[PDB]
Request: fold
Amino acid sequence: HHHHMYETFMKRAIELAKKGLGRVNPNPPVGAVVVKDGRIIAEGFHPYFGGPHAERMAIESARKKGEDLRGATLIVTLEPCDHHGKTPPCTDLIIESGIKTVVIGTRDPNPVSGNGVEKFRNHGIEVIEGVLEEEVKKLCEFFITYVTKKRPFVALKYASTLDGKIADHRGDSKWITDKLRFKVHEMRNIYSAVLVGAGTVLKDNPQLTCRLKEGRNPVRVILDRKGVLSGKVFRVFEENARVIVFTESEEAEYPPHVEKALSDCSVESILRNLYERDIDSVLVEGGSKVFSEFLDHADVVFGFYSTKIFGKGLDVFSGYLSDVSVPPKFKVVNVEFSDSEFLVEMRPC
Amino acid sequence: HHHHMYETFMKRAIELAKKGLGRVNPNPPVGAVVVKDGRIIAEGFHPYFGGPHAERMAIESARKKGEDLRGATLIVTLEPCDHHGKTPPCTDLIIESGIKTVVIGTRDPNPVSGNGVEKFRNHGIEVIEGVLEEEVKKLCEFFITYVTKKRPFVALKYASTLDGKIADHRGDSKWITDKLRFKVHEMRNIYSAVLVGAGTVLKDNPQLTCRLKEGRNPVRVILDRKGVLSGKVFRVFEENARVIVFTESEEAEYPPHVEKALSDCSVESILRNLYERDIDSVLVEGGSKVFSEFLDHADVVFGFYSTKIFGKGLDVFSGYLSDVSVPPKFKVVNVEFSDSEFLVEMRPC
Ligand SMILES: NC(=O)C1=CN([C@@H]2O[C@H](COP(=O)(O)OP(=O)(O)OC[C@H]3O[C@@H](n4cnc5c(N)ncnc54)[C@H](OP(=O)(O)O)[C@@H]3O)[C@@H](O)[C@H]2O)C=CC1
Ligand SMILES: NC(=O)C1=CN([C@@H]2O[C@H](COP(=O)(O)OP(=O)(O)OC[C@H]3O[C@@H](n4cnc5c(N)ncnc54)[C@H](OP(=O)(O)O)[C@@H]3O)[C@@H](O)[C@H]2O)C=CC1
Ligand SMILES: [Cl-]
Ligand SMILES: [Cl-]
Ligand SMILES: [Zn+2]
Ligand SMILES: [Zn+2]
Reply:
C-alpha cells in the first residue's frame, strides 16, 4: 500500500533530482517531495552547486502555499544533511516543520553530511530507508564514485561502424552518428567534463560543446602529451567552456584562458588531477589511442553503432591488444536502436 | 470481435506452421486451425516437403474426432492450393467438408497453386484475406523469395568483437559467441543451406552442423574457387549432410559423397546453382572474404557481438571498401542481448 506509494513518490523525486544534473556537480542531484494525506503538496530539487537543498526548497514552497506540514511525509532521494552550511542543516528544518516520516532512497556516503537518519529517529520521526535505492544510486553514481573512490566517474563513448571502425580509410569520421546524436548531447549536458586526444583535435577540429542551445558546455579536457597543439587556436580552445590541456611539454603554449596542466600524463595522474579540480565525471570521446588507454578505467562504455561498413579504416581500440582467450570484461545492460543506428551500454563485470 | 479472434487463431496457425521449418523447404511452412462455435476443434501443419498439406491434416483430424465441419471456419496461413497433386486439391477438401469461412494470411505467389480464393467464393464461402499478413510473409519469406526472385533467400551471420574482429591477431576465432549460440543452431535447423569459404575450413575445420541433437543438419555449401581443399577430409566433408563444393578447379578432388560443382563462382552463379538444387535459403557464415562478397546480396544480416575487444585482428568485411560518404544500406529491426553478448538483426533499406 504505502510502499507502492512511496515508490511512486520516489520516482517523482528522482525525476525532480535530474533537473540539476550537470549543474550540481560535484554535489549529488537530489529530489524531494512532501506528501500530506496522500497528495504531493510540494516539490524541490537541488538546482546548482552550492544552491539550496532539495528538502529546503520543498519545505519552503509548502509553507509559502500555506500548507501545515505537521504530520506530513518527506520523500527524498538522498539522506538529509545534518551539517550547518550557510544555513542550518536540513535535519533541523525537517524536524521543526513537523514532518513525521522521512523516506530516503540512499544514505549519504560523504562523512561530512553527518548522521541524519539517527537524528531523525531521536526526534520521534519514522525513517524509511532504501526506497528505489538502486535507481537512486545510479542517479548519484558520479557523486558516489567521487566521494568513495576519490576520482571522477569515467564513461567511454565511441561511434563505430559494424566493423569496428571509428574512421574510414582516409581518416574521415563524419556522419557516423545521426539519429542518436541527441544521446551524445544529453551526455555532454550531464557529464562534468569531456575528454579527447590531440590526434582527434588535429584531424577533426571538433567543438566538443553541448549542442543543446539551453544546455551547458562541459569542461573540455585535452590530452596533448607532446604539445602538438601548441600555438594554434583549435575549436576546443574557444572560450565557451573551461578548458584544461594535459601535457608533458614545457614548451607548449595554449591560449591564455586555457589551463595548461603539465603532467606525467598517466591515466592515474589525469584522474587525480580532475578530482582535485572538482570534476566528478568525465566522458572520454576518443580517438583510438585515447580509447585504448582509458578502456580499462571506464565505469561505463557507450558504443554508438551505425550499420555503415567501411571495410578498412581506423579501429576503435587500435592501441589495445587482447586475444580470444581473455574473457569479456563487460556486460550489456541496455541496447537501443533507431533506423540505421544502435547504442549499447556496457558495464564492467 | 471476430477480427481479434481471427488474429488469435492466426497466431496459433503461425505457431503450427513453424513446426515444419527446415523440413518443408523449398515448400512454404503452413499452419491451419479449424474453429467451430468459437473453439479450435482441430489443427494441422505441413510437416515435410511433399507431405500432407496443413489443411488436410486439420480437416482429417477433425473428422477422426467426429466433428461436424459443416458451418465451421478454417484459418490457414497460406491460400489453399487448387491443384490436384497426389491428392485432390485442398480447395475441394475444404468445400466438401462444409466449411463456410476461410481466413487466409497471404495469397500463394506460386502460379501453379491456382485460384483458391476465387474457387471458394464461387462455392458460397466467405474468404477473409490478409489476417496477420505481414507476420505470415515473414514466416514464408524463404518461399516467397524462391518463387518470386528465383534464388535462395540469403542471410549473413557473423560473430564479432566490439571492434569488428572475427578473429584475433593469431587468426583464432573460438569462443566469441557463447550465450547466443542457441540462436545459431536455431538458424541452422531452419535455413536449407549454410555456406563457408575455404579459408574458414582451412583455419577452423568447422563442423557447420546443427548441434541440436534432434534437429537436422543443413546442406553445407563450401566455396573453394582454387581447390585448396582438395585431397583432404575436413569435417565439413563428413557424411552427415548433403555437401556441395563450388570451385573453378578441374583438378580438385573431394570425397565421393560430396558434390563437386565446377563453376565460375560468381555470387550470381552460386545462387542460381543453389536455386536449381531446390535450396530456398542460405546462411552465409564466413569468413571475411566470403562476408565481403555476399554482403551486397544479403536479405538479412545477423551481427552476433561480444563485449570482447581484440585490438588487432581480422576485420569482418576485410574485402569490402566504403567510406563515410556512403549512406547505410541496412536498418536495425531488432536487438537482443544477454550477459556479454548482443545480436543485431539488420535488413536492407
Ligand atoms: N567515430 C568516433 O567515435 C571518433 C573518431 N575519431 C577519429 O579518430 C582519429 C583520431 O584518433 P587517434 O589518431 O588515435 O588520436 P587520439 O585522439 O587518440 O590522440 C592521440 C594523441 O593524444 C595523445 N595522448 C594519448 N593519451 C594521452 C594521455 N594520457 N595524456 C596526454 N596525451 C595523450 C597522444 O600522445 P602520444 O603521441 O605520446 O601517444 C597523441 O599525441 C581521427 O581519425 C578521428 O577522425 C576520433 C574521436 C571519436
Ligand atoms: N567469428 C566469425 O563469424 C568467423 C570467423 N572466421 C575466421 O575468418 C578466417 C577465415 O576468413 P578468410 O581467411 O577471409 O577466408 P574465407 O573463409 O572467406 O575463405 C576465402 C577462400 O574462399 C574462396 N572464395 C571466396 N569466395 C568464393 C566464391 N565466390 N566462390 C568460390 N570460392 C570463394 C577464396 O577464393 P580466392 O582465393 O580466389 O579469393 C578463398 O580461397 C579464419 O580466421 C576464421 O577463424 C571464419 C568464419 C566466421
Ligand atoms: Cl563535436
Ligand atoms: Cl561449427
Ligand atoms: Zn541539506
Ligand atoms: Zn493444399
